[PDB]
Design a protein around this ligand. Structure first.
Ligand SMILES: N=C(N)c1cccc(-c2cccc([C@H](CCCNc3ccncc3)C(=O)O)c2)c1
Ligand SMILES: [Ca+2]
Lengths: 235, 91
């Protein structure tokens, strides 16, 4: 996350971290339930092998509360496209159930119609992760969050040099140096309504990080709510 | 103070002192029952704590898994210590 701030105690509990064979984070995810993590399909191709670690607030050192979970099954979307990142969504079934506790809790999955009319129509959303603190800097050892305004579709398309499909949406600022970055991908984008946070997107990609005239591209979850429903019944 | 008939839409005016009270009938809110009860979700999410949709030109609230719709039919009651979407603000 470029800009924004570190999550405050209990603030970003639905955050998950895909750690590679070296136990280093390379992508994020959203805790959907005790056995399921939501993430980006494209992250599936960025690690030889990985596990999902939850409850982590500082990757620097073990402070207790963290738990690593092995993945039992990977449910990547069939129509995922590596060039446009269309259908950039995947669900992960854990071998062992997460134990909801402090800084470890799921994010609500909203009903599609309501999310569109009442969530996607909010002024902003929230994105978090341990990704790059700068377009070419190091990743954050601390879990960070950033409120990002929702960006109109045409405005998004216009500002994009790459195709913006209906399975995506834009969030972020025009020139303000705040945005998600490499390392946050797969991570959550949630919209708050009356102090209840609903998953609304998946950090997918973006031309650089916090670039002028550039926005953050998120997988539009509302387009995959039924798909996620069926996926969470797998194995 | 009920003399002036301050309750609108046939409200139940109950007198007291330098004040009066209106008990609103069906489909009215406000000190004088002058406001229209939740008929759409666009205005205040229909007073719903979470999901809102309209059933028969009327607002109907619902909640996410791990919650139960309260008796008032607006609020959402957690069924557990860790419902989805709630930050774990414990300390
Ligand atoms: N600013 C953000 N919100 C954002 C969020 C997450 C990741 C990136 C990002 C930044 C620079 C380079 C790459 C690349 C990913 C290349 C894919 N590029 C595209 C372009 C158009 N459609 C699909 C994919 C990387 O992983 O190194 C990814 C930007
Ligand atoms: Ca740690």
């Amino acid at each position: 996350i470029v800009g924004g701030q570190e999550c405050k105690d209990g603030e970003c509990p639905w955050q998950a971290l895909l750690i590679n064979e070296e136990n280093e984070g390379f992508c994020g995810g959203t805790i959907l339930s005790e056995f399921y993590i939501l993430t980006a399909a494209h992250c599936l191709y960025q690690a030889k092998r990985f596990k999902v670690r939850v409850g982590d607030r500082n990757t620097e050192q073990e402070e207790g509360g963290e738990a690593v979970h092995e993945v039992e099954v990977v449910i990547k979307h069939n129509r995922f496209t590596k060039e446009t990142y269309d259908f950039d969504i995947a669900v992960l079934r854990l071998k062992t159930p997460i134990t909801f506790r402090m800084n470890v809790a799921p994010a609500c999955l909203p009903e599609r119609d309501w999310a569109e009319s009442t969530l996607m129509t909010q002024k902003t959303g929230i994105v978090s992760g341990f990704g790059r603190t700068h377009e070419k800097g190091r990743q954050s050892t601390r879990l960070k969050m950033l409120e990002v305004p929702y960006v109109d579709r045409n405005s998004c398309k216009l500002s994009s040099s790459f195709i913006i499909t209906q399975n995506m949406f834009c969030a972020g600022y025009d020139t303000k140096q705040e945005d998600a970055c490499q390392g946050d991908s797969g991570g959550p984008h949630v919209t708050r309504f009356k102090d209840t946070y609903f998953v609304t997107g998946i950090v997918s990609w973006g031309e650089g990080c916090a670039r002028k005239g550039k926005y953050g591209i998120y997988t539009k979850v509302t387009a995959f709510l039924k798909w996620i429903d069926r996926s969470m019944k797998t194995r | 103070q009920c003399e002036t008939s301050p309750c609108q839409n046939q409200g139940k005016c109950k007198d007291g002192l330098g004040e009066y009270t209106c008990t609103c009938l069906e489909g009215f809110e406000g000190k004088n029952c002058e406001l229209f009860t939740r008929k759409l979700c666009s205005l205040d999410n229909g007073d719903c704590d979470q999901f809102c949709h309209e059933e028969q030109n009327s607002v109907v609230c619902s909640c996410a898994r791990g919650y139960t719709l309260a008796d008032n039919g607006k609020a959402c009651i957690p069924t557990g210590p860790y419902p989805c979407g709630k930050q774990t603000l414990e300390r």
